[PDB]
Design an enzyme around this catalytic site. Structure first.
Site, mmCIF file in Angstrom:
data_model
loop_
_atom_site.group_PDB
_atom_site.id
_atom_site.type_symbol
_atom_site.label_atom_id
_atom_site.label_comp_id
_atom_site.label_asym_id
_atom_site.label_seq_id
_atom_site.Cartn_x
_atom_site.Cartn_y
_atom_site.Cartn_z
ATOM 1 N N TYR A 242 -6.059 5.013 -27.674
ATOM 2 C CA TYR A 242 -6.210 4.034 -26.598
ATOM 3 C C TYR A 242 -7.057 4.585 -25.440
ATOM 4 O O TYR A 242 -7.346 3.851 -24.489
ATOM 5 C CB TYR A 242 -4.838 3.575 -26.081
ATOM 6 N N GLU A 256 -9.619 4.602 -19.400
ATOM 7 C CA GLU A 256 -11.003 4.138 -19.552
ATOM 8 C C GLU A 256 -11.978 4.746 -18.534
ATOM 9 O O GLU A 256 -13.184 4.488 -18.606
ATOM 10 C CB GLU A 256 -11.062 2.607 -19.484
ATOM 11 N N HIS A 310 6.069 -5.261 14.097
ATOM 12 C CA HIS A 310 6.431 -4.752 15.429
ATOM 13 C C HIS A 310 5.309 -4.832 16.472
ATOM 14 O O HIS A 310 5.559 -5.212 17.614
ATOM 15 C CB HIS A 310 7.007 -3.329 15.354
ATOM 16 N N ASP A 346 8.862 -4.643 7.639
ATOM 17 C CA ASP A 346 7.973 -4.626 8.803
ATOM 18 C C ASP A 346 6.574 -5.028 8.344
ATOM 19 O O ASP A 346 5.679 -4.189 8.198
ATOM 20 C CB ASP A 346 7.972 -3.229 9.443
ATOM 21 N N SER A 419 -1.464 0.538 16.293
ATOM 22 C CA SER A 419 -0.276 0.421 15.453
ATOM 23 C C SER A 419 -0.491 -0.556 14.296
ATOM 24 O O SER A 419 -1.432 -1.349 14.307
ATOM 25 C CB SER A 419 0.924 -0.018 16.295
HETATM 26 CA CA LIG Z 1 -7.580 1.880 -23.677
#
Ligand SMILES: [Ca+2]
Ligand SMILES: *[C@@H]1O[C@H](CO)[C@@H](O)[C@H](O)[C@H]1NC(C)=O
Ligand SMILES: *[C@@H]1O[C@H](CO)[C@@H](O)[C@H](O)[C@H]1NC(C)=O
Ligand SMILES: *[C@@H]1O[C@H](CO)[C@@H](O)[C@H](O)[C@H]1NC(C)=O
Ligand SMILES: *[C@H]1O[C@H](CO)[C@@H](O)[C@H](O)[C@H]1NC(C)=O
Ligand SMILES: *[C@H]1O[C@H](CO)[C@@H](O)[C@H](O)[C@H]1NC(C)=O
Ligand SMILES: *[C@H]1O[C@H](CO)[C@@H](O)[C@H](O)[C@H]1NC(C)=O
Ligand SMILES: [Ca+2]
Length: 461
Positions: A242, A256, A310, A346, A419
């Site tokens: 795979y 891949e 916040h 949050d 923030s």
């Molecule tokens: Ca694959």
């Protein structure tokens, strides 16, 4: 040997679980689980196929999507249905009904032949038992040993299946030149590591790259593979072949990267419309109010900007402007279960006024970041780009050690420095993911883990 993780096993992820695996092209991801999409949503381009009820379908996707929605309707043959053609598998020369030597009657060929055991695995075994009525696939510990007899002819059918197919008809058959002795494929179908479907198997079969279970329970919760299987960072194992086979198997996508009817399903993926996400900091936004306090937004798509709660609710005026170009914010949606002190949930969505009075919110030249659909996309020791300049932070494990019960591992992520600003991470194919938002040496930054809010995001987006 402690390959398998235990804390997942409660949540029981099968091949129908998005968080650990890709949904088949005749399915769509909804709330972490693969659901049926209607036949008229499949890609148009495909050659016709035949279902066991003698009905014919233009595309292979469309058949599998009807089987998905409408049980019973199995697969039979490539191309249109013949009148005479009819598929059959059977267990002959056996002491019980759930065992024997496999006999296949290939829809077109009137002749009946046996299978060769030199290539016979659990992939084929499970698929065989599955159309034989036994929903738990093949037995792994038990066998059916022969003692000659009916070992005269040279006939044989090599078979190969992916492993998740709902019929041997779907698999690929090729007549081989049989050696000996002895070469005839037997099977014991399961009639009572535990799988999610209810099948017990030995622990040595767990996490080796092979689907022994039938619905992938023994492969999705793996810190490291056993044999030749290749470990996805997402905590899943895949067969070595795979690797670099033109199909992104791991949700992380690493098999891949770094490369220079089973074939039909792969074809159906490559035609699906891929998301245009995460192409210095194009996604970076700044939510400024008329007072004069800023938050570090992150552009995810269209009208939507994602931030921390916040900082938004720090404003008294409740009216903002999105800077990066200036848009206006129409409305703001905070997560309903925001807990001020603990900082759980949050997170908040900002919805822009769009303006122009003729089209849509999207900016002429702005790149949206990618929103993670799975919490298993990025893991510890992964590097991520914090911003609020930009600092390369790293994701840290076992954050109980630092904060204990002030860190809720499902809803929060800790990033250790080395923030409401973004914690952006990139996968091997250069996809920029919004992994976290800034929430609150032995004090690593804590981030509300966005992947755990994809459903929530989706609900409004
Ligand atoms: Ca694959
Ligand atoms: C398949 O796609 C091509 C373009 O790649 C298009 O020209 C053709 O019309 C499509 N096939 C069908 C049956 O619509
Ligand atoms: C499968 O079906 C198509 C017709 O739908 C046929 O023309 C083709 O030869 C068949 N075989 C393969 C390998 O595609
Ligand atoms: C990521 O971007 C670089 C730019 O230097 C590019 O060369 C590379 O091909 C991209 N990554 C992959 C996996 O293709
Ligand atoms: C049975 O038939 C096969 C193939 O026709 C031939 O090898 C031989 O006559 C018999 N086989 C054995 C092992 O005696
Ligand atoms: C996590 O990443 C660090 C990078 O320095 C490295 O030690 C290793 O890849 C991982 N740590 C351990 C203890 O395996
Ligand atoms: C997690 O805490 C345990 C002790 O409870 C400690 O052994 C381990 O080093 C911590 N893990 C990390 C990655 O800091
Ligand atoms: Ca296995």
């Amino acid at each position: 040997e402690d390959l398998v993780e235990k804390k997942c096993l409660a949540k029981k992820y099968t091949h129908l679980s998005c968080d650990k695996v890709f949904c088949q092209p005749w399915q769509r991801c909804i709330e972490g689980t693969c659901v049926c999409k209607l036949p008229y949503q499949c890609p148009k381009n495909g050659t016709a196929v035949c279902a066991t009820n003698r009905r014919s379908f233009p595309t292979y996707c469309q058949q599998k999507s009807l089987e998905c929605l409408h049980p019973g309707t199995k697969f039979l043959n490539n191309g249109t249905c013949t009148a005479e053609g009819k598929f059959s598998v059977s267990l002959k020369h056996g002491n019980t009904d759930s065992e024997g030597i496999v006999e296949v009657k290939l829809v077109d060929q009137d002749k009946t032949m046996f299978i060769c055991k030199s290539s016979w695995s659990m992939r084929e075994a499970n698929v065989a038992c599955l159309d034989l009525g036994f929903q738990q696939g093949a037995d792994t510990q038990r066998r059916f040993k022969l003692s000659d007899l009916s070992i005269n002819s040279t006939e044989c059918l090599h078979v190969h299946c992916r492993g998740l197919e709902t019929s041997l008809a779907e698999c690929t058959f090729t007549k081989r030149r049989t050696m000996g002795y002895q070469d005839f494929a037997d099977v014991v179908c399961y009639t009572q590591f535990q799988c999610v479907n209810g099948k017990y198997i030995s622990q040595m079969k767990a996490c080796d790259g092979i689907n022994d279970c039938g619905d992938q329970s023994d492969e999705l919760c793996c810190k490291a593979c056993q044999g030749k299987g290749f470990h996805c960072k997402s905590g899943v194992c895949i067969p070595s072949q795979y690797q670099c086979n033109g199909e992104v198997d791991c949700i992380t996508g690493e098999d891949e990267v770094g490369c220079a009817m089973d074939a039909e399903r792969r074809r159906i993926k490559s035609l699906l419309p891929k998301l245009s996400c995460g192409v210095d900091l194009p996604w970076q936004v700044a939510i400024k109010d008329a007072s004069g306090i800023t938050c570090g937004g992150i552009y995810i798509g269209g009208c939507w900007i994602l931030t921390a709660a916040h900082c938004l609710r720090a404003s008294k005026t409740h009216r903002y402007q999105i800077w990066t170009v200036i848009e206006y914010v129409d409305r703001i949606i905070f997560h309903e279960n925001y807990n001020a002190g603990t900082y759980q949930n949050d997170i908040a969505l900002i919805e822009m006024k769009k303006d122009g009075n003729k089209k849509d919110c999207e900016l002429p030249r702005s790149i949206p970041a990618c929103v993670p659909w799975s919490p298993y996309l990025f893991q510890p020791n992964d590097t991520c780009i914090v911003s609020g300049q930009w600092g390369e932070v790293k994701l840290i494990s076992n954050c109980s050690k630092f904060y204990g019960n002030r860190f809720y591992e499902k809803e929060m992520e800790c990033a250790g420095t080395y923030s409401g600003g973004p914690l952006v991470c990139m996968d091997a194919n250069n996809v920029t993911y919004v992994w976290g938002v800034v929430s609150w040496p032995e004090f690593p930054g804590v981030y509300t883990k966005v992947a755990n809010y994809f459903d929530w995001i989706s609900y409004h987006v």
